[PDB]
Write a protein that binds this ligand. Sequence first.
Ligand SMILES: CC(=O)N[C@H]1[C@@H](OP(=O)(O)OP(=O)(O)OC[C@H]2O[C@@H](n3ccc(=O)[nH]c3=O)[C@H](O)[C@@H]2O)O[C@H](CO)[C@H](O)[C@@H]1O
Ligand SMILES: CC(=O)N[C@H]1[C@@H](OP(=O)(O)OP(=O)(O)OC[C@H]2O[C@@H](n3ccc(=O)[nH]c3=O)[C@H](O)[C@@H]2O)O[C@H](CO)[C@H](O)[C@@H]1O
Lengths: 480, 485
Amino acid sequence: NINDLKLTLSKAGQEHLLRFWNELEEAQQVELYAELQAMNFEELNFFFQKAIEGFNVDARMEPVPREVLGSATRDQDQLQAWESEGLFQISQNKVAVLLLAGGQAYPKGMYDVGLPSRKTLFQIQAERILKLQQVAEKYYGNKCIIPWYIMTSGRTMESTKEFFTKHKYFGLKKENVIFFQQGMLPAMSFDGKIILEEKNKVSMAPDGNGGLYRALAAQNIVEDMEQRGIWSIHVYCVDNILVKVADPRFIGFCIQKGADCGAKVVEKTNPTEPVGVVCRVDGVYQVVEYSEISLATAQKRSSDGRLLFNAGNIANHFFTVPFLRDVVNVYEPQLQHHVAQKKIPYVDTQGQLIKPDKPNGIKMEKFVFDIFQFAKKFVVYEVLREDEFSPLKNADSQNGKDNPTTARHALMSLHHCWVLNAGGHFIDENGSRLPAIPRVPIQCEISPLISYAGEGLESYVADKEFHAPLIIDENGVHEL
Amino acid sequence: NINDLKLTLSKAGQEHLLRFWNELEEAQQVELYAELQAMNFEELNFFFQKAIEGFDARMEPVPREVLGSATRDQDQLQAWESEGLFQISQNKVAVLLLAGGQGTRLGVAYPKGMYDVGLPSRKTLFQIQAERILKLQQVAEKYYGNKCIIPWYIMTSGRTMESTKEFFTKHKYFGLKKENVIFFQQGMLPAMSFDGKIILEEKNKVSMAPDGNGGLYRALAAQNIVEDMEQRGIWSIHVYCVDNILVKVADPRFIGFCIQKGADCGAKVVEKTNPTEPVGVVCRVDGVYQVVEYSEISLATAQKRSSDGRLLFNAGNIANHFFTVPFLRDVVNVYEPQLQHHVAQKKIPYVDTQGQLIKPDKPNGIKMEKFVFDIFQFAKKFVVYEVLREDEFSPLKNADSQNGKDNPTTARHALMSLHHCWVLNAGGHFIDENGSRLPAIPRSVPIQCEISPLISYAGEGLESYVADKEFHAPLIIDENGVHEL
Ligand SMILES: CC(=O)N[C@H]1[C@@H](OP(=O)(O)OP(=O)(O)OC[C@H]2O[C@@H](n3ccc(=O)[nH]c3=O)[C@H](O)[C@@H]2O)O[C@H](CO)[C@H](O)[C@@H]1O
Ligand SMILES: CC(=O)N[C@H]1[C@@H](OP(=O)(O)OP(=O)(O)OC[C@H]2O[C@@H](n3ccc(=O)[nH]c3=O)[C@H](O)[C@@H]2O)O[C@H](CO)[C@H](O)[C@@H]1O
């Protein structure tokens, strides 16, 4: 019935949600009905109650102990051993990857950064997956698979799926790319009243990348992982053009250390850089998001002169399947919602659409890294920024950096260095050799299919000079 | 005597510079005649021979004994600062701005000093620098009680001299006295093709460009600038680059540090963390101190890391040096001639045989330049002072995220972010429209905060303005008070 909904709405004190029901057409009424039925108002009030209460952790924060910190630089003597371990896991079909792509206008993964090859982030990531499958198979002699779970939201589900089919899945098997949708949460005013965006539309938005755990349960994702025989899952953010998807070194490091949970970080050197920091609070590992840290804590220096909290989270995590299992149906409830005031477009009492110039409500979100505190063995792996982290944030968030152009330059500079490191050289139109840091930038792009992290370029560049822009793909060397 | 000049040019292998003489009007030939007459072709050939002929592994980090750190040595900051302010109060400090470069890469035809990065107050780099000088004159007068002066020497080039002077006069020298601002122009060098021929830009014009910021030393001689410093009784000179919006002009800490260490030469640096960052690195070769420019370092060296995990060569030059007047006196009268030219291959526009203008597709010649830090090697006592990037270095080098970073946007955001931090550290707070307190690192305003140097030089003196208060950004704090835009 449609009367049970009115009884429930009044039981939660959220009856106002049906104030324009008598002015709505059949189509409108059925569209709103399906939206309200899929909501747990009793639980939502509970959520708001706890969340709003948040209207100090800093004193309790402790640095990451050297005992759990691994470093690709300081521990380069172990890189080969870890990489081989991660490579073996991949060849045994025991490694899967999970992309967080529920955030929003079109899918960030479809961004064309302007590379000479013009590939999108999604494609670059897929070629790194394909490449690792190739390398592992040519190293252990067996076709292996790395499933690609992609968490999407109601805002990008349809759009993303069509983009992948249009591209034949970039060369991957459609059956190994799993799309699952993330849940939503209603915007609420400071008094705890769900906000109507339209006369027949509740104001909704994705429930944070931490909504991942509820989505896994809803779509039985964990069971699918256990069915495939996966043991390790690499979770990562979609906007980092340099992301080493299924990175064998990180995976090998975590497995070698017998961890059930791991976090990859880069050295944070600017106190106000917008990255959360890995730390320990009351004996348990956590990440204090950048928006929740105080200036005094963010600016604190240690004896050696570096920031005390310098483990910048780059949203690249390692989770064992069994660990995710326990989180999905045991710990999940313990996760709390982080709150943010927003200016939410809504329908006033006069049935008019208003765009407030002042916050009129809050948004609740769960964070993917809030499960670190439940791990039995947490580990941290430090890498170099120029090799693995160059995020692309929205236009209003760019501010000179973290934009399409800085992302493009970061990948091309990296590939340019791989060329020089493999004995290659660049020259001008007169054949004069160019310096490593010219006073063009030297445009250079190397497809992941050819090189994953700079290896296997000896045959293509050793003792050779090139005229940039240089491109090296599955079709050889091309000097545009 | 056009016949003598012809003979002089030909003996130097340069007679082609008069190739279009018979096509120029009487007026155009008098200009070419004067320009050529003011050139030393013999010297130019010698310079070309050394440069053309010039066609690592010995580098070493500086010993910890010569490197001081604002963070590691925080305990000594107060003493160094006191020494610096004392020097200033005794009228023993002058500053020297390098502004002979053009603002072309930025997309404009005027001097970078005049650029407006869009701050709330709309102030230019020149003005902000001027108020930092004024502030230290006032601060010093309050600690010691006497009125003091910090002479401002400004090196321009042929292409920035006129604009700069007119801009300053139009603004009343930003509050400073005209007699304490000294403008002097650096020299120029001609572009030359690989064969050794000086290049003509027009039938009657030699292709000329500023001779490098190291051309400062030759200019100091040609304008008798050192005599002017000695006459003023100056002991310490702070040399700095115009494009760094965060530059601490006449910084009493850096100056005091150098004085206490008995240095005659010092360089300020920030830690270089990215192997390919375009800053030179301070180091030493055969016991001699120097800077290896980013364009002359090899990738293997740039990438080298030490045990602690940081780059082996991590002392990044931010073009902020300290020189004493006696040392510059020796540079000008002895060392200068021993300074070498750095060569850059370039595509230079020229006039061909058929009298046609051409823009080469391949590099056709070279440009020679001297570097301001190449005198470190002659210092009797060289020291290095390391500071934090977010507090002291944010360069303006590119158009506007049409080259990535080091553009107007990042420069504006770096100054405002710094001032926002000052407010927070002094006990202030920022709030939204409903009085709710904003976080130190908000999810993307960015917070717009701008504090005049006349109020705070480096974050001090703000407690009476913001302790326990909350502000709606944009926040401006200047000589007229606190203003919430
Ligand atoms: C919570 C979190 O991870 N914060 C990290 C993330 O913050 P950010 O504020 O940069 O990003 P964000 O939390 O909005 O989203 C990060 C990733 O999560 C995805 N997403 C976001 C919301 C949602 O409901 N669903 C969803 O799937 C989004 O598509 C992206 O792939 O990145 C920074 C690096 O630049 C850091 O490492 C910050 O610590
Ligand atoms: C030679 C030198 O200092 N290199 C430094 C300078 O390189 P850059 O290549 O970034 O700059 P640059 O040498 O073109 O000029 C630096 C400063 O010198 C001035 N100038 C330049 C040429 C000239 O003929 N006359 C003149 O006065 C120019 O106006 C600016 O104030 O800045 C970087 C930081 O951003 C570093 O610290 C580099 O090591």
